């Protein structure tokens, strides 16, 4: 209907100039620029795109600003755009005149590849910087003041592809969905960069939604059917544990607890968040036993439950580097839920979390006024957490509107 | 009360 156009549009028009107003009124800081490539950049929206904070941060004390340049994944290259912020968030018009006119160049490109997936690492061993996972399951280690890649590891071209990194940066594992089982790919990332370690295809599972390490010799799974498959460093073909979670919905994504090397923190498209225990689900035992797919949902009782903005399918979620408390949970529209369990720890040590429990447990709700639109472009990777600023995200829509903020608990530590 | 990209509109009533 053509009134349907002038329906979301116009609800939302409003909306966005409802959360424009308590814009100053909710966060410490909050901007927004437009990214500004050279010539032969493709601006489309549809265009396959990643962000991810770089540990390069500056200090600027004679204008009271903090640049932290971020890398900004559009298609073959790799732009770098320097944050400006100010100093007060963790220890501003020109700031902004100089990025918005200031034309990013390319500093790392990898011709022939598109850019799913990034992690920077600062590794003085192989001298690397970042290691961009491309759609085809490809990846690129590119070095300081190097616009072509050092090492690569290049797979036939015909999707998804998810890349995670040990956490001593030694052990490097990729996901080939392949149109044929899914396959968790092994790289030493440390002296043989860009050799396959190993090859453990999946049989069963087309494709591999998520990988996450859990330790330096412990790496998870995760396919489509939501079933959690944990296969380890050791020479084994199938995973030393299998966690199947059926009742808050569909499993899509996991996260690792920086801090406790047992608790997780799960999601599912029932927009439920769950914060389970390693050592429970490797205490059933015995995952040799026939992989009865009709066996109901394992009785393993998490150890705390919240739920997402109306069940919305949480797509992604990441510890804090910096806090064991603070939690960031993407949902399926773009809304970066933050999400802080210190009220959870403090109900467990006077001792289900209550409706007012987990409104509590809720630091804020950042939509950008409805304007990160449900494009092709999956956001999953679109969204970076700083590592060393505290509460400090960034966003990319598919709109191009890059979003740098921190928002305001109101609690003041 | 219960209802009495024209889904799109829908959708967005039930979350606010």
Known sequence: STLDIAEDNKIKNEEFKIWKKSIPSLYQHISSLKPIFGSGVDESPSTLRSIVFTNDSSCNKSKGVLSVPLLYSQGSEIFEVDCIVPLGLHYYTMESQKVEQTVLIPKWEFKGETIAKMIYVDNSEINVKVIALSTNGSLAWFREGVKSPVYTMMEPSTPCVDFAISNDSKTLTVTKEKHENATIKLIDNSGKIGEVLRTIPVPGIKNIQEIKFLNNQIFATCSDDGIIRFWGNEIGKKPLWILNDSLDGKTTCFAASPFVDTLFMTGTSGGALKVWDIRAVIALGDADAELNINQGHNKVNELFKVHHFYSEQVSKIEFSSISPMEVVTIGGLGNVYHWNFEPVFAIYNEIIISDELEAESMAFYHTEGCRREIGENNKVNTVAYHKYIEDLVATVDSDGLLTVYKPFTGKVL | ?16
């Open chain 2, 1 to 16: 009360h219960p209802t009495e990209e024209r889904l799109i509109e829908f959708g967005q009533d039930i979350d606010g």
